[PDB]
Amino acid sequence: SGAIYVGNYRVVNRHLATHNDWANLVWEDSSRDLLVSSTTAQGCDTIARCDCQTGVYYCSSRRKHYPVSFSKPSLIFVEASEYYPARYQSHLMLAVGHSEPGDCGGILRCQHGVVGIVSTGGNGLVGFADVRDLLWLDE
Ligand SMILES: C[C@@H]1CCCC[C@H]1OC(=O)N1CCC[C@H](C(N)=O)C1
Ligand SMILES: [Zn+2]
């Protein structure tokens, strides 16, 4: 679990969104595993606007942060799960690292701010849904 709070927006994994996220929907994209909902309180986070390919992410299943090198956002095949059929997920960045069920929502950050959130795992890999291209989160 986990979310990004920026301005009057809450960014979560689409497959973990709650009834309240859907009742306050701003934007969602099943192909990216993202959903953004509106909040009444001002958020705690700032978004990176950069091309970093190294950063640090939080892994809840180990209660620790790990440094990673990750690929540029791309279209990657993701196997069928109880949340989605087998499909290509877009704007996804892979890295070698630990990720198990429950780790989705962990934040990946670089020196410029939040880069994205954990969205895929298994096989000694961790995949992150990029948010750096969503410029409207800042306004
Ligand atoms: C994080 C899990 C670790 C063990 C192996 C499976 C890993 O699950 C996943 O990669 N997904 C399940 C939830 C939905 C994700 C998505 N963005 O489509 C894909
Ligand atoms: Zn950066």
Q: Is 38 in the pocket of ligand 1 (CB under 6 A)?
A: no
3-state SS, one letter per residue, for the chain:
CCCEEECCEEEEEHHHCCHHHHHCEEEEECCCCEEEEECCCCCCCCECCCCCCEEEEEECCCCEEEEEEECCCEEEEECCCCCCCCEEEEEEEEEECCCCCCCCCCEEEECCEEEEEEEECCCCEEEEEECCCCHHHHC
- Is 110 labeled as ligand-binding? yes
The CB of 99 under 6 Å from ligand 1? The reply is: yes
Partners of 118 in the β-ladder: 128
Distance 46 CA to ligand 1 centre (A): 26
Catalytic entry in 21, 59, 91, 104: 104
Which residue is associated with the tokens 């670089």? 110
Q: Structural domain boundaries of the chain?
A: 3-44, 45-139
Q: How was this structure determined?
A: X-ray
CA distance 65 to 28: 28
Query: Rg for the chain (alpha carbons), in Å?
Result: 14
- Distance, in Å, from the CA atom of 117 to the CA atom of 17, rounded to the nearest integer, reads 14
CA angle 127, 101, 68 (to 5 degrees): 35
Query: Are residues 16 and 1 in contact, defined by beta-carbon separation less than 8 angstroms?
Result: yes
Strands 34-38 and 54-59: unpaired
Residue 116 buriedness (CB in 10 A; 0-12 / 13-18 / 19+): buried
